Write a protein that binds this ligand. Structure first.
Ligand code: YMF
Ligand code: ZN
Ligand code: ZN
Length: 232
């Protein structure tokens, strides 16, 4: 009823949307992994009379449910999607999207990692993002490669009309004590990558993590802190 939806409030298979700003929503879904349930976020950005989707809802059935929830709540077609790294909470559902007519995109690095690891593979390669600090425009957003962090390929997304920074899994929520799933992370470079985000987006008003509650710029420093302490 208006609060940001949480893991115990979303059954696995259902999707909720949350209005972040004019023409900007997050999507929230839940999924089981290794016998525990987790929430995860993505983004939806209005692109004239179409929508740009950032990240799947972590699985085929969740992503079908996402499309249905978008049709119910917004009613504009999703025409393009960008996945911000190669893990299943970002690309699982790309096959559903592609069969629904959504053009799916990711960096060449994400596409190679998804293919190698057996995850679903976005169709189109996003060039111009291979060096840390690179940025490219994609409809109503800017895509930014901050360097290795949660994964070597992680991208962040900025919505300049609303000063919304979607950090994806390179950014953790304020209540997080841990650095999340660090299986493919670079803990040594992660703080440097966060510093690049902080320098590049000093006017961000909302910061959205890949999992958990949005907040303000403090999520960036908090992420650096928790990663450094995990490494320690
Ligand atoms: C694990 C590798 C295969 N050996 C590929 C994995 C799986 N996976 C993704 C799909 C994943 C699964 C479960 C939990 C989390 C979290 C998290 C966040 N708070 N607590 C845990 C995170 C994150 O922090 O983004 N992501 C997760 C991921 O990230 O690595
Ligand atoms: Zn991940
Ligand atoms: Zn994640």
């Amino acid at each position: 009823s208006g609060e940001y939806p949480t893991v115990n409030e979303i059954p696995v298979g259902e999707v909720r949307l949350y209005q972040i700003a004019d023409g900007v929503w997050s999507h929230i879904a839940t999924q089981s992994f290794d016998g525990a349930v987790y929430p995860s976020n993505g983004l939806i950005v209005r692109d004239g009379d179409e929508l740009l989707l950032i990240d799947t809802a972590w699985g085929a059935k969740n992503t079908a449910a996402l499309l249905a929830e978008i049709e119910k709540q917004i009613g504009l077609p999703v025409t393009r999607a960008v996945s911000t790294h190669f893990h299943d909470d970002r690309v699982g559902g790309v096959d559903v999207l592609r069969a629904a007519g959504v053009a799916t995109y990711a960096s060449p690095s994400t596409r190679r990692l998804a293919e190698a690891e057996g995850n679903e593979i976005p169709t189109h390669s996003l060039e111009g993002l291979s060096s840390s600090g690179d940025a490219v425009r994609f409809g109503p957003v800017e895509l930014f490669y901050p360097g290795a962090a949660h994964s070597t390929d992680n991208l962040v997304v900025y919505v300049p009309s609303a000063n919304v920074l979607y950090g994806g899994c390179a950014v953790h929520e304020l209540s997080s004590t841990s650095a999340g799933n660090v299986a493919d992370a670079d803990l040594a470079e992660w703080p440097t990558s966060v510093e690049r985000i902080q320098k590049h987006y000093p006017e961000a008003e909302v910061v959205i993590p890949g999992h958990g509650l949005p907040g303000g710029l403090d999520l960036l420093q908090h992420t650096a802190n928790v990663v450094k302490a995990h490494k320690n």
